[PDB]
Structures are given as structure tokens and as C-alpha cells.
Subunit: 219 residues, 6 copies
């Protein structure tokens, strides 16, 4: 069962409303790398993850992501409230969709569950979550670069910081399985080609060198 | 510039056509975890990755994924050719869309670029690619469990094996950046909350224990 | 702030796992009339509804819908557990996506926020919510008719009951505004054609008769 | 069978072409709350509604919405006509998609039938139609606020007015069944929790969580 | 302005209801190659086509496609009528979405305007329409192969026949402009590579890569 | 088997980076009429086209379209490089998605395979391809009109030229089958209404006149 207390995870503090910025911020409300993606991805995984500890962790983090979604929603509300008459607002999708957050991204695309990567095996799920967190942190960085005021910026820095934290959580979980630095998982024995690297576009590195790989220079 | 030689990466060998299986196999042609997703994800990343070595690696692997896409296409062609009159075929989407592969998944959904995770920073891209590979390997495992004949199975095992190989390539690339086992990347200094773990759903593990985290048992 | 208790709102009791029914039940997990649609529609509205009482009501109901989502997910989990060798399971999308719920409908479509109807005016939102509850109730009735065992049916009858409850709540909120049975709302004065009915397609009712309307028999 | 007369229900009259506004107007052409949504929703319902009176009503209204769609199309055409040289036009999706209406919304999203709400019981359909009309009216109000000239505004006011009329029609149909203010419909009897209100977000009270209608559970 | 007569162009006659076939038939209702696609594509083009003859043709054909859509709808209704108890019906999307047509394809995908191809030059539009008709015909052929009874089949044969007629109409319109067999259109002159064929996949030859039309580059 | 040479088919030469134009150019990268649509449409057709000559032609052209896709991507890269402080860049989707191409259109829509028209009969495929080339040519013309500098324009004029070339190839293939100017194709005999024209909307042309048609003036 889910419950809600009405206070956000911390105070929403901003300067003058900047609705063009609010539109960019929709990325982290209803966009691919956003808070709904994170919350729903981790929560839906929890239904098929058999490891009780990792299942709990997924639920703990998912609930935090819902709190982040709320914070982002409150930021968008603050940056789109009471500025109907401004040229800035009239240039945004809020002018036709209404003020406040909506489950779409900065380009007006409806959130889709096609954004989610999950299923089958906890190792796939955790690797997917490390990727999700990387997209979330990246988008927060871009938004921070475009910050309209110091209060908005500090909130975004906090949210970004929490995705680094989550990344570390997922890495610890994967490492506990022995699968953070080992490529192999699942139940299928590989064939004899696992070490081959084909030079199909024609650079050397650890990804195509001894000891790990047999380099095929001219496939 | 791209080029094509008409022989596939190895011989397509199957038993009797199994078009219901061919429909499942569409996952790896036009589905989320499929070969187009992999090829396009890695290829589009190569345009914004500044590291010359990793850029080449992305292109090398992308071109292999296109060859995998071809192999999967040829498998679907073989399992849907010349069986128009069979009850099995009439129950599949091929009956109305035509024989052979199409860029949709096993449920008939059109492939969408919403399946892709990419942008901004090579560390995000590589983490996204490790996730993509995990989804691809997972789906191949499910398809192997449902294999209609030994020849089809061996091809799928080969493709699965190559995604383990790619996973290792991406892990080596990330490790060369120092970012396979370190959660932090990007250009934003975190705030003071990076070590906090909130017990919001109420299990202990390395993801919420000392030394790494300060456990908040009752947020 | 959101928080989570691990007990669902009641115990999942089913008979023999029925994975084909589990796929049908996805309608109420990731489908248009499902629990995610309800939760997200009412929650996102709460960010722009200024009446404190109605804002709170929307949040109270949204959190219940999240609990419903959990119940539905647990039913899908139960009906897809340890049956992956059965022909029934192999005929479902779970065979390639993995056991348990996914944010898709019964046809394999990814959930999309295009399913939501929200924005601008609390009267629009509440009418949208009465419509959403009607779709939810409808779908639960169809699932009840198709239910595989008594325990599953019982849970669905409860879920259906709560959507009748929610309908009444939304009606009471609308009536409190004088807008349950008054068609007019918003800030634009109607012109002189407001009470006209054009017979563009001879059936008669209070939707095209005095005292409500002037009937144009031949436009 | 369908037919078409080449005259719209009233001819367009606009000021200077405003292609940025034309893009906003796409919301009522190919958007969620737009005229195609209304027309297709009511028309597709007419196939499975057994009540002859309500079936006819749905078809009557669906045909009017198709005329509204044409009107909006003509407005968009007028506001993107002979202005392809202007910086305004170059800033809009018409610069790459061509002049005139397209079945997209103001954000360039393709119209999708995921916007429709229909199926099963006539009560579900009528309640969905009251909701669609509310959305349609709302969008027209925002477009009226943003409108470029008086002629365009007057047309949008007319279209908005007709959605208020349609709302009333759907309300009268529902009331004709006794289901306008009765929440219950369908063939499943509610269980014993039907009158409970759970205070899951916490203290605001109203008729939605107070007697006589509800038993309030203050601490679930 | 649009109008509607309640009689379809010919009334349905089917055998036993076949709801699995009804689901396949959704392809021509809410699918990519279906009647809504054809109707909306030709209608939306009519707003930006300046040639009066071709504009009228597009509207003429668009109205026929709307009648086709109605016919397909009625077929789907007939094939999902009074069979909700049957195992066949329970296996179809109608069991959860309700009887009758829905703006979905045979796979349960919502119709999307991404299925449309339109904009800019009349030649682009007419070539898109020849392609849409080819897709429409193709899907009807597959449905005819799969058809459940003679009455249903005969209707689908008729609909297919009309798409052949429409193809001819679009071809005659294009030919009327001299652009049926002339690849060039628009206002940009081709550069010097216009006649080159690159053998990028390798040796098959045909009129598409041989003189007189092309200079063949055997090893790019 | 696919392989890749790193030289694009010609050198990217632009003037000052113009990120707003780069966003427009996305139409031909991830948009409906773009290069990915062309490449994937012709390639996927090649799996079910049995005429060896036409199969090969489809593959020859598809590989060229992939080279075009690369050219377009390199143009977008060039026009979004090292300008992220400019107000122009900050107004584009690149500001939150990262520099360089993405598989989206100029409106931020994810590419979808719903853009493709393919299946069943080589005549359907070739007609679909003539239509795709027309859309591609149209979009290139609009971009040329909007081009930011001479070098960019030059590349676009070349790309446009090749779509005229491709159109001619598809016409020659169709004509080789006798189906460029013959409306009829497929395996179903037409009924007796095939030469009728209904005047459902008084303009006349060879599309509703003898010798081709019998004109029904009043249906
Ligand atoms: Ca957009
Ligand atoms: Ca979109
Ligand atoms: Ca290389
Ligand atoms: Ca499906
Ligand atoms: Ca779909
Ligand atoms: Ca916990
Ligand atoms: Ca009437
Ligand atoms: Ca409360
Ligand atoms: Ca060749
Ligand atoms: Ca005419
Ligand atoms: Mn977060
Ligand atoms: Mn996170
Ligand atoms: Mn692969
Ligand atoms: Mn791979
Ligand atoms: Mn519910
Ligand atoms: Mn509810
Ligand atoms: Mn209307
Ligand atoms: Mn209306
Ligand atoms: Mn038709
Ligand atoms: Mn046609
Ligand atoms: Mn091209
Ligand atoms: Mn081309």
C-alpha cells in the first residue's frame, strides 16, 4: 500500500517564474530520462525480482523517485503560475495545455512506457537502472547549465546528487551478484566466438586487444 | 560511407518453417531490445563521442549489429516463407502484413526511437549500451528457450554470445575512463546528500550500509 | 512525499495460475482505462487545482489508485509464476517479456500519457475523471466476466466497487461547484447558437427538444 | 453513406495571416481535444450503441464536428496562405511540412486514436463525451485568449459555444437514462466498501468524504 | 460542410459471425492501409492543392473512402454481434474493448496520423496516393484470402476493386501534369550525379542501372 | 554483411554553425521523409522481394540512403558544435538532448516505423518507394530554401538530386514489370465497378471522363 504526506522532500524556492525553463524541465517530469521513468522502471521490476534485498532496494529507490517527481512538478508549477499574460509563457506549450506539469517532455511528446528497460533477470534490470540513472543525471546537468535562478539550480543539483547516489546503490547491488564487472549473465552457455572483435569500421584499445579479445583486423 | 556484401555472417539453417516463432523473433528485428535498437543507438552516439577510440568501437559494433539484424531478418524470412496456407501462419501478423521481417515487435508495435538511450556524455552512452546489451541477451535467452529447431537455436546462441562479447567491450571502454565501478561522472559537483539512503519502503545490503551510505531508517 | 508499506490492501488469493488471463489483466495495469492512468491523471491534476479540498481529494484518490495498481500487479505476478513450460504461458507476451506485470495493455501496447485527459480548469478535470472511472469500471466488468477463479474475481469486484465509489466522489466535488448538471463552465461567454440542435443525420429526445433546444430539422 | 457540400457552415474572415497562431490552431485539428477526436469518438460509438435515439444523436453531433474540423482547417489554411517568405512562417512547422492543416497538434505530434475514450456501456460513452467536450471547450478558450484578430476570435467563440451545446445534449441523454447524477452503472453489484473514503494523503473535508455520502477513514 | 445518409452504399450480408476475422478486418478500419488513412490523407491534401480539378477529385475520392470506412465498420459490427459468449470472441480484443469497430489495427495498435503521407507539391501528394492505394489493395487481398464466408468476401472484393479505380484516377491526374513517368518535379535543378548508379551492394543489372538511363558505377 | 568506411561520400563544409537549422535538418535524419525511412523501407522490402535484380537494386539504394543519413548526421554535428552558449543553441532541442544528431524529427518526435510503407507485393513496394522519394525530395527543397550557407545548400542539392535519381530507378523497375502506368496488380480479379467515378463532392478531367471512366454525376 502507498501513502503520501503533503510536504515535499524540501522547500521549493525560485525567483521570477521562467516558463520557457519550465518547459525544458518537463524532461524530468514526463520525459525519457525523467522521474516517472525511474519510479515506474524500478517499481515494476520489483514484482519479478526474487532477491528479497534487491527487491526492497528497488522499492526504496522507486518511492524516492516519486518524491523527486513531486519536487519537479512543484518546480514546474512555480515557474508557470500566474504568468499567463507574459510573452515568454505564450511561447510555451503551457499556453495551450494549461499551467503546471503534464506527463510530456520538453518537445510536447507524451510519456511512453517504451522509455522503460526491464524484464526477465535482475542483472538486466540493474544494468538498465544504471543506464537510467546516467540519463537522468545527464539531463539534470543540461538543465543546471540553463538554470534561471539560484534556488532552482540548488534543487536540480540536489536531484542530480541523488541520481549519483542511486547509481552507487545499483552498482553495489550488481557487485553483490558478481555482475558489475563480469559481462556474463543468464543461463545460456556461450559458443566459441565470445572473444572475437571484428574491425568492421576502418583504433585499438582494451576492448579489442589481448588478453581479452582476438582482433579480426580484416573481416 | 556504408557498404554491403550479400552473404550473411553465417549460413541460415532451420527446420520446418515455424511462423509463430518467427513472430516472437520480431523482438530482435523491430523490438526494443533488438538489433536495430543496438545498431542505431551505437551509431548515433558515434557522432557526438569525442574519444576517437571509443567512437571507432561504437562504429565497429554498430556495423556488427546491422549484420545481426540481417541474420535475424533471414531467420524470419525462412520461418515465414511458403507457408501461407498453414493454420499456424494464418494466426500470425504475417498473414496480413506479408511474409518476411517487418520493423515491428512480437506484439505488432512499430519500432520507435523512444527505445534508444543516448546523448550528452560518453559515460552515459556506454552505461546505456551495457543496458541495451543486457536486454538483447535476455530476449535471445527467452527465444532460445522457445527454439523450434536446432539450427535456429544455434544461430540464436551465436547472437547471444556476441552480445556478451559486446558487453565486455563496453565494460572495457568504461573501465578505461575509470567509470565502470565509480558512480560519479559529469561536470557538476554534488551536494552534501550523496551518501544518504532513505528507507522509504518498509532489508540491508552494501547499497544501504556502512561504509558507503548513511542509512535513514525512518525518513 | 510518498512512502510505501509492503502489505497490499488485501491478500492475493488465486487458483491455478492462468497466464492468458494475466495478459488480459494488463489492461488495468498498463492499459488506457487502467490504474496507472487513474493515478497519474488525478495526481497531475492536483498540481494545478487551487481548491484545497478538491486538491486533497485528488491526492487521496490517486494514492488509492496506486494501491490498486499494486493489487493488479500482484495478481498478474501470481498468474504468471512458475508456469513458463505451459503452452498457455508460451502463447502470451510474458514468454518474451518475462513474468510479472509490465506497463503495457493486453495487446502489448506501451502505456502512453495520451491516455490522460487533464488541464486548465477543475471542471474539465472532474468531468474527465468521471469518464476515466467509467472506462475503468467497464474494463473491470469485462475482466470479471472472464475471470479464471473465485479469488481473482473477488479482488476484481472490489476494485470495480472502488471505481463506483470514486465516481461518486468526483460527482460530489462537481456538484459542490454547481457543475455536475450545468453544462456551462469557463471564462468565455457563449454566442446565440448555444441552444440549437442541427439534424445533420427521425429520432427525438430531450437532447433536441424544448425546453432545452431549438430543433433545426433541415440544415 | 457520407456526403459533402463545398460551402463551410460559415466562411472564414481573418486579418493578416498569422502562421504562429495557425500552429496553435492545429490543436483543434489534429490534437487530443480537437475536432477529429470528437468526430471519430462519437461516430465509432454509434456502431455499438443500441438505443436508436442516442445512436442518431451521436451521428448528428459527429457530423457537426466534421464541419467544425473543416472550419478549423480553413482557418489554418487562411493563416498560412501567401506568407512563406516571412520569418514568422519560417519559425513554424509549416516551413518543413507545407502550408495548410495537417493531422498534428500544436507541438507537431501526430494524432493518435489513443486520444479516444469509447466502448461497452452507453453510460461510459456518454460520460466520455461530456469529458471530451470539456477538453474541447478548454482548448478553444486558450486559443481565444491567444487569438490574432477579431474575425478568428469570433469563429473560435462560435465553435466553443457549440461544445457547450453538445455538453448539454450528452447530459440530457444521460439524464434520460437516470445516470447523470447516479454513479452506478453496469451489471456488477458493489461490495461493502462502496461508501468508504480513505484519507491516504494527509485535514480537508468536503461532501466527497463526509456523511451522508461517505464513511470517512481518517487514518488508513 | 459534411452530411450523412443512414444507408450504406450496399448493406452487409454475412454468414455466422466470425469475431477473429472481425479483428483482422480492423486493419481496414484503424490500420495503416485502411479507410481512415485514405479518407484523411486525401481530405487534408484538398486544403493545400491549388488545382481546382484535382482538389475536387481528392474530395470526391475522400468521401467514397469515408463510405468504405462505414462499410468496414458495419462488417466488423456484424461479425462481433451476439457472440460474446463464444470462445472465439473471448480470444479477441473485442472481449476487453467491447463489440463493434474501434480505431485500432488487427494488432490492437491505435491509428496514428504517422500513417499519412502528404504535403507540399501536388506531385508528391498524388504519388503518395498511388502508394496508399497499393497498400490498401494489398491488405484487402490478404483479407479476401482469409475471409470467413462468401458475402464478406464479395464486399471485400468490391472494396479492393474501388482501390484499383482510385489508382487509375490518381495516375490520370498525374499524367494530366506530365508527371506519371517523369521522375522530376519541384524547383531545384539536379546536379551532375543525377544519372549515376552506385553498385553499393555486391552482379545484377537491369534498366534501373544500365544505359541509356544510367551510368553504372560498378565499384564505388 | 555490412561494412563501413569512415570517409563520408563528400566533405562537410559549412559556415558559422546554425543550430536552429540543424534542428530543421533532423527531418531528414529521424523524420518521416528522412534518410532512415528510405534506408529501412528499401532494405526491409529486400527480404521479401523475389526478383533478384530488384532485390539487388533495393539493397544498392538502401546502402546509399545510409550514406546520406551519415552526411545529414555530419551536417547536424557541424551545425551544433561548440556553440552551446549561444541563444540560438539554447532555443533548440540540442540544449537538453546533447549536440549532434538524434533519431527524432524537427519537432522532437521519435522516429517510428509507422513511417514505412512496405509489404506483400513488389508492385506495392515500388509504388511506396516512388512516394517516399517524393516526400524526401519535397523536404530537401524546403530545407534548401531555408539553408544557412552555401556549403550546406550544396550538400542538400546533391542529396535532393540523388532522390530524383532514385525515383527514376524505381520507375524503371516498375516499368520493367509493366506496372508503372497500369493501375492493376495483385491476385484478385476486379468486379464490375472498376471503371466508375462517383461525383460525391462541377470539375472534370481524365480521372472522371471517357475513355477511362463512366461518370456518375449524381450518386
Ligand atoms: Ca514538438
Ligand atoms: Ca510526438
Ligand atoms: Ca575499427
Ligand atoms: Ca498487439
Ligand atoms: Ca502499439
Ligand atoms: Ca527498505
Ligand atoms: Ca437526427
Ligand atoms: Ca486527505
Ligand atoms: Ca548491386
Ligand atoms: Ca466532383
Ligand atoms: Mn530522481
Ligand atoms: Mn535516480
Ligand atoms: Mn546483436
Ligand atoms: Mn550487441
Ligand atoms: Mn482503481
Ligand atoms: Mn478509480
Ligand atoms: Mn467541435
Ligand atoms: Mn462538441
Ligand atoms: Mn477504400
Ligand atoms: Mn482508395
Ligand atoms: Mn537519400
Ligand atoms: Mn532516395
Amino acid at each position: 500500500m502507498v501513502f503520501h504526506k503533503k510536504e515535499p522532500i524540501h522547500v521549493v524556492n525560485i525567483g521570477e517564474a521562467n516558463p520557457r525553463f519550465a518547459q525544458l524541465l518537463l524532461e524530468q517530469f514526463g520525459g525519457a530520462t525523467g522521474e516517472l521513468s525511474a519510479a515506474l522502471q524500478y517499481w515494476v521490476q520489483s514484482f519479478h525480482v526474487e532477491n528479497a534485498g534487491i527487491k526492497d532496494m528497488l522499492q526504496d529507490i522507486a518511492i524516492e523517485e516519486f518524491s523527486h517527481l513531486e519536487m519537479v512538478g512543484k518546480l514546474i508549477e512555480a515557474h508557470t503560475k500566474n504568468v499567463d499574460q507574459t510573452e515568454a509563457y505564450k511561447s510555451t506549450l503551457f499556453a495551450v495545455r494549461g499551467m503546471g506539469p503534464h506527463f510530456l517532455d520538453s518537445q510536447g511528446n507524451a510519456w511512453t512506457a517504451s522509455y522503460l528497460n526491464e524484464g526477465g533477470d535482475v542483472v538486466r534490470d540493474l544494468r538498465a537502472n544504471i543506464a537510467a540513472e546516467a540519463g537522468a543525471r545527464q539531463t539534470y546537468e543540461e538543465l543546471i547549465k540553463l538554470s534561471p535562478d539560484e534556488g532552482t539550480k540548488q534543487t536540480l543539483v540536489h536531484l542530480l546528487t541523488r541520481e549519483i547516489s542511486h547509481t552507487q546503490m545499483f552498482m553495489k547491488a550488481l557487485d553483490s551478484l558478481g555482475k558489475l564487472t563480469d559481462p556474463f549473465f543468464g543461463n545460456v552457455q556461450p559458443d566459441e566466438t565470445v572473444a572475437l572483435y571484428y574491425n568492421l569500421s576502418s583504433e585499438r584499445g582494451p576492448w579489442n586487444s589481448e588478453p581479452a579479445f582476438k582482433y579480426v583486423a580484416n573481416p
